[PDB]
A paper describes a structure:
Recently, the novel ‘reactibody’ approach has been developed, which is based on the chemical selection of bio­catalysts from a human semisynthetic Ab variable-fragment library followed by eukaryotic expression in a full-length Ab. This approach has been used to produce a novel organophosphate-metabolizing biocatalyst named the A17 reactibody. The previously designed organophos­phate-metabolizing reactibody A17 has been re-engineered by replacing its constant κ light chain by the λ chain (A17λ), and the X-ray structure of A17λ has been determined at 1.95 Å resolution. An X-ray analysis of both A17 variants has shown that they have a well developed, deep active centre with the nucleophilic Tyr-L37 at the bottom of the cavity (15 Å from the surface of the molecule). In this study, we present data on the effect of a κ→λ light-chain switch on the structure and function of the A17 reactibody.
The results showed that the asymmetric unit of the crystal contained one Fab molecule and four domains (VL, CL, VH and CH1) with the canonical β-sandwich immuno­globulin fold. As calculated by the PISA program, the interface area between the heavy and light chains in A17λ is 1785 Å2 and there are 18 hydrogen bonds, one salt bridge and one disulfide bond. Alignment of the Cα atoms of the two structures using the LSQKAB algorithm resulted in r.m.s.d. estimates of 1.1 Å for the heavy chains and 4.1 Å for the light chains. Such a large structural deviation between κ and λ chains mainly appears to be owing to the J segment, especially to the Gly-L110 insertion in the λ variant, which changes the orientation of the CL domain relative to VL so that it forms a rotation angle of 29° with the latter. The elbow angle of the FabA17λ molecule is 126°. This value is at the lower limit of the range previously recorded in Fab molecules (125–225°) and differs considerably from that characteristic of λ chain-type Fabs, which tend to adopt large elbow angles. The major difference is that the upper part of the A17λ active centre is shifted away from the light chain. This shifting of the L-CDR3 loop, which is mainly caused by the strong interaction between Tyr-H53 and Leu-L96, leads to the displacement of Trp-L92 by about 4 Å, its flipping and rotation. In the presence of co-crystallized MES, Tyr-H34 in A17λ is not directed towards Tyr-L37 but turns to form a hydrogen bond with Ser-H51. Although the average ADP value for all protein atoms in the A17λ structure is higher than in A17κ (25.1 versus 21.5 Å2), the ADPs of the A17λ CDR loops are much lower (17.0 versus 25.4 Å2). Comparison of kinetic parameters for A17κ and A17λ shows that the induced-fit stage is more rapid in the κ variant. This may be owing to the less rigid structure of A17κ, with the entrance to its active centre being wider than in A17λ, where it is significantly narrowed because of inter­actions between the CDR loops.
Residue numbers in the entry:
A (entry chain H): 1 to 231
B (entry chain L): 3 to 216
The structure:
Amino acid sequence: QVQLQESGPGLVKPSETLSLTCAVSGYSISSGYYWGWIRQPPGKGLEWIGSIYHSGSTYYNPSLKSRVTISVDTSKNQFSLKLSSVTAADTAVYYCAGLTQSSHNDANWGQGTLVTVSSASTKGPSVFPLAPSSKSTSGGTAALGCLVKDYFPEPVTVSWNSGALTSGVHTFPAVLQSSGLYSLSSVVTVPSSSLGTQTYICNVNHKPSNTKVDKKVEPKSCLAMDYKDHD
Amino acid sequence: VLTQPPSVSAAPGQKVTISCSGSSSNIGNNYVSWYQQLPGTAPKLLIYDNNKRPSGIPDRFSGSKSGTSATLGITGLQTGDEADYYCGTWDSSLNPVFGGGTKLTVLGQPKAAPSVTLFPPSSEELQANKATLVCLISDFYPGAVTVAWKADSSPVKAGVETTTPSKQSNNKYAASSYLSLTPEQWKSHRSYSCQVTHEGSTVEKTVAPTECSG
């Protein structure tokens, strides 16, 4: 099927030029009737940014003061948005979208990409395991997790057992600390019995910086290895 | 340019409608589409071509068009329908235009107490001369709590960062609070507590540097 997916740096310095691309798959891009960009600032509605048509004609939102450029690259099968001289008013989730035919308005939409306009520098996170314990044991289940600390900007992605674990998995919304860096935690609920005989690792990806890392998250043993420990 | 009510609410099981009004130059002349947007998610196409549903959209949703206005109908209202809804069409200049959005609230949801999980600082963090207590708060309704930390029996205000509660899938909310300490402070007290107050009732969790469960 037709799929759109945005790419861009999640951080742009004020006055610099924001550059995003939209990768089209399951479709030859030059076939499309319409490709466009829509954005949504936090807690607000949807704003049209600009458009390009099959004919190559481009139209842009007048409120965007000649700052917008949209082009199609057929060799890479993607289209782009360039928005110059950005301010904090341009912080938003940006969506690519398209209509394959003039006769229908069933638009295809990307997933959206968060763009933060800030002078602050990119910072990869520090990851720490959150070991399961008797206190984090309720029923036959055990909570363990990962603390993803002090990063910028949003977002971070966290996966458990490389996607193979999804049930009971809760990755919490991040806090913005007074330092201006984010932290979040991802917890997975598992069976208590599996704790000794299962490997649990959280995979943390901060796309904006080049941070990939995974912590082992395992029970703390409370028996010394160099003394008899069993009856 | 397209206007819809900023908010609508109704009890579960009921039928609800949301309309957007425009001009004969926009809605009057064009197909209208409708979008659903759940927290932290891209708008999802519900209705296109005035009344068609994309595959996978349930027949509880319907679209109609009366003159220069359009209407989204939702039957068998579920808590999972809570979301922002937007109409979209072409304006008189043939460019995209969206309604302002309608926030749909499902009334009469039962109160739900927060589940609280508190983690002590990891050994690795302590080794890096740092210490964070992590208080994770989930599955409450309504989505408002206040969080208080204690060192032994005394309130701690400093080094506390707490999130505004945000909506999750089950429309149960989640929140977290992080207390920053020196490894010495952590290792000097009998314990630390995270106290979560929701609708008059308090749920409390405690961690101690003496703990070793195995």
